[PDB]
């Protein structure tokens, strides 16, 4: 019951999920080969949320790996965790995406999506009672953006009532490593609006900032930033897999995170984050963890909450903890900072408490915020977009691939309308 299909898409999608199924595969004591080597029978009661048991107690995930380039697949196969996936789930083309949206959504994506939805139906027809899906992908890539939004817009036609959420990486102007990532991000924000139930917006600068300031790292790679992100994605569905005192599925969050439809862009947050060495000097508690979660410097989205108001938040704690301290800390926050909350919603916070912490510490927590300050993201992109597009730069690589202008102007307007949706719900009483 309550299975989750994992569709990691693109290059970025595969890197995160590579590290994602290295965490989950530790949560449940899965061997690299696929056998089970746990001790506690909590690890197995709800293993089936992610893993198909196969013949002779091997555990094959329900993940589908999609790419338009053979490379990432060959890396994953040849690595520590190649053994863990089913080889019919490594679905990939040959001709690269171009870091071009048109090329992954119309030309070379449509060719492949038939051979992938046929793998979605291998997974969906085997489940007892499916709950949801998930992309892991990148707004700013070819396959992450384009092919991802082709997969999504073809699942709503098949499975129109399952919680489909994305962990999408969004561009930041301070750190650019692709010239047309405004073009590629604009045309996919357009698709995520109408098609998705929850969207966890993650940036790059926000992850260095955690590494530098909080964790006291020296030299971060993609390897390190997605290792964080995977500890968030584990937290989301903890109460789906572990027993808790308050439970919270995918659907439970969705329901009371999202005031209006369409405003389904969340800001995660993790706590605790210490350096090694500076762990014997923080006392690890619930007021300690709450103060980090309401800190700006522990947002994995490169914004400051202080430039708006949280509509709603959720607080997912993992550990042997109290309920008074939880119910109090979550109270003392929305009193002391009552101008940082939307006031037409009483009790902006939802708490959930699991019983099972991560496999090195006690008392973690995970903050998921629906803040109005996320329009700071959508405007920084729609300024770069409108500065290139007024010249019509880089246009022939897009009109060459089946698109035209009128897909742009509408997609620019769909991004600029929801800036005026966070804006309405920040102010006006």
């Amino acid at each position: 019951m309550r299975e989750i299909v994992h569709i990691q898409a693109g290059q970025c999608g595969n890197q995160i999920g590579a590290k994602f199924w290295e965490v989950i595969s530790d949560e449940h004591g899965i061997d690299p080969t696929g056998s089970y080597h746990g001790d506690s029978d909590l690890q197995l009661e709800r293993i089936n949320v992610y893993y198909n048991e196969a013949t002779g107690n091997k555990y094959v995930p329900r993940a589908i790996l999609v790419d338009l380039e053979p490379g990432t697949m060959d890396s994953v196969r040849s690595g520590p965790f190649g053994q863990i996936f089913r080889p019919d789930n490594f679905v990939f083309g040959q001709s690269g995406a171009g870091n071009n949206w048109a090329k992954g959504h119309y030309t070379e994506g449509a060719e492949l999506v038939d051979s992938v939805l046929d793998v979605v139906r291998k997974e969906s027809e085997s489940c007892d009672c499916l709950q949801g899906f998930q992309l892991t992908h990148s707004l700013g890539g070819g396959t992450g953006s384009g092919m991802g939004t082709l997969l999504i817009s073809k699942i709503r036609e098949e499975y129109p009532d399952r919680i489909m959420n994305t962990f999408s990486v969004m561009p930041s102007p301070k750190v650019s490593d692709t010239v047309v990532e405004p073009y590629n991000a604009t045309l996919s924000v357009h698709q995520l609006v109408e098609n998705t139930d929850e969207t966890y917006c993650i940036d790059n600068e926000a992850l260095y900032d955690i590494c530098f300031r909080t964790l006291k790292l020296t030299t971060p790679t993609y390897g390190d930033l997605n290792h964080l992100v995977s500890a968030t994605m584990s937290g989301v569905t903890t109460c789906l897999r572990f027993p808790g005192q308050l439970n919270a599925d995918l659907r439970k969050l969705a329901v009371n995170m999202v005031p209006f439809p369409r405003l389904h862009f969340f800001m995660p947050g993790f706590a605790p984050l210490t350096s090694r060495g500076s762990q014997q000097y923080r006392a690890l508690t619930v007021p300690e963890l709450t103060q980090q979660m309401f800190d700006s410097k522990n947002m994995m989205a490169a914004c400051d909450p202080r430039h708006g108001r949280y509509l709603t938040v959720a607080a997912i704690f993992r550990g042997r903890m109290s309920m008074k301290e939880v119910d109090e800390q979550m109270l003392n926050v929305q009193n002391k900072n009552s101008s940082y909350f939307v006031e037409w919603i009483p009790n902006n916070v939802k708490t959930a408490v699991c019983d099972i912490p991560p496999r090195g510490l006690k008392m973690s927590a995970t903050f998921i915020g629906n803040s109005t300050a996320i329009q700071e993201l959508f405007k920084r992109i729609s300024e770069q977009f409108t500065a290139m597009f007024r010249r019509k730069a880089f246009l022939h690589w897009y009109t060459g691939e089946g698109m035209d202008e009128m897909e742009f102007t509408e997609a620019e307007s769909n991004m600029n309308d929801l800036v005026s949706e966070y804006q309405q719900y920040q102010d006006a009483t």
Partner: protein, 441 residues
């Protein structure tokens, strides 16, 4: 499989390729007799020799390259030389007389006689490909075969194939140094196919390389053999992310998508930052930060040019080796900070980074030292119009008196063709005047 085709045309095009195909032999661990040695029980097309080397049966590696000359003589340095059994015999195609610094001969008279034999060599390599990437034409503007023949081929390659990338590695005429006096005649006429048929034309010239050898590198007295090892590290890095693993890999098509704004604005100059002599390789701080700044140096350019005279339009960082990205993003943010570096006002988001893990190889007997990191920066700038103004003026001088016209007309072209290729290049130089300028409201 990410396979690619090298075509090496004319004397300069062949003799570069010696220095290219010397290198890949070292990159993938291949002896000059085409053999991988016994210490490679690892994944071959996982080290991906398979983009430049079709593995003949019984452990034997022969390129996907074609060496074309209208003169027998140049390629006969490759037979023997040392590469006499590296190459497939049938991919070393010789004429009998060269075009002889005459575009009309390389394109109409002499070129047509071997053009179908060369296109048929392409098909024998085109049909062995699985996932063909594109072509790498090497030549020089200002030969006969490098200009006349290349123009003939690129027409035929556009018709048969269309879809694939077609990179060029030209040598542009140098403003002072020149050895042919009809050097500008052969450059105006190659303008036509370079903007139309190529997808991305690179330009280098010999003086801007003389600077780097003498100044960064303290070589007293360069020859062509010395310059071309340098040329080859630029191309070796370009095409390295096809064929090695790294985070932020970059296919051949991800250049053009990220480097090239408009249809015919596709003349990006390359640089290369760690050009350091052995002695000067200590007294290094050869971090990522310093090597990113060195790309933006107007002295470390591969073209007689000064980007302080134009605005950059895109850049494109291709790094090899011991690299942490956040060092790069902190070195970008420095680059965006400086006001000596003009981007245009419609770029905003500067540029694309790409990293690769495979460190360069030191070419034996070569000029570089052992570096840990290395960076080409392919970069569109409006400063390459200045290279053109200095060469149109040489053409416009000689064609004012109709000097060497009688050689050209009596070989299979018209007087009328000079007036069209001069207008054609004058329109390019007008495009860069209109692409440097922002629009205001």
């Amino acid at each position: 499989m990410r396979e690619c085709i090298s075509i090496h045309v004319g004397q300069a095009g062949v003799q570069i390729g010696n220095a290219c195909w010397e290198l890949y032999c070292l990159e993938h661990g291949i002896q000059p007799d085409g053999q991988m040695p016994s210490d490679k029980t690892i994944g071959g097309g996982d080290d991906s020799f398979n983009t430049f080397f079709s593995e003949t049966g019984a452990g034997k590696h022969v390129p996907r390259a074609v060496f074309v000359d209208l003169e027998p003589t140049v390629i006969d340095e490759v037979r023997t030389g040392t590469y006499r059994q590296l190459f497939h015999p049938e991919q070393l195609i010789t004429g009998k007389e060269d075009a002889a610094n005459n575009y009309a001969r390389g394109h109409y008279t002499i070129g047509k006689e071997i053009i179908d034999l060369v296109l048929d060599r392409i098909r024998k390599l085109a049909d062995q490909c699985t996932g063909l990437q594109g072509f790498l034409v090497f030549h020089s503007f200002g030969g006969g075969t490098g200009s006349g023949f290349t123009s003939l081929l690129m027409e035929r390659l556009s018709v048969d194939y269309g879809k694939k990338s077609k990179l060029e590695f030209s040598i542009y005429p140098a403003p002072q140094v020149s050895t042919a006096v009809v050097e500008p005649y052969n450059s105006i006429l190659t303008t036509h196919t370079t903007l139309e048929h190529s997808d991305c034309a690179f330009m280098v010239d010999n003086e801007a390389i003389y600077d780097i050898c003498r100044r960064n590198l303290d070589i007293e007295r360069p020859t062509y053999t010395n310059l071309n090892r340098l040329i080859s590290q630029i191309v070796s890095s370009i095409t390295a992310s096809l064929r090695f693993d790294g985070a932020l890999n970059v296919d051949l098509t991800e250049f053009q998508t990220n480097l090239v704004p408009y249809p015919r604005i596709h003349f990006p100059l390359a640089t290369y930052a760690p050009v350091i002599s052995a002695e000067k390789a200590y007294h290094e701080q050869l971090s990522v930060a310093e090597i990113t700044n060195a790309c933006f140096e107007p002295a470390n350019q591969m073209v007689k040019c000064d980007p302080r005279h134009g605005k950059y339009m895109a850049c494109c960082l291709l790094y090899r080796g011991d690299v942490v990205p956040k060092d790069v993003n902190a070195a970008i943010a420095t680059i965006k900070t400086k006001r000596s570096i003009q981007f245009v006002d419609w770029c905003p988001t500067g540029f694309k980074v790409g990293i690769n893990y495979q460190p360069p190889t030191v070419v034996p007997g070569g000029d570089l030292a052992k570096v840990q990191r290395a960076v080409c920066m392919l970069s569109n700038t409006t400063a390459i119009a200045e290279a053109w103004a200095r060469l149109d003026h040489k053409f416009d001088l000689m064609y004012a008196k109709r000097a060497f016209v009688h050689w050209y007309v009596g070989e299979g072209m018209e007087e009328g063709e000079f007036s069209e290729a001069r207008e054609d290049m004058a329109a390019l130089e007008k495009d860069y005047e209109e692409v440097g300028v922002d629009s205001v409201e």
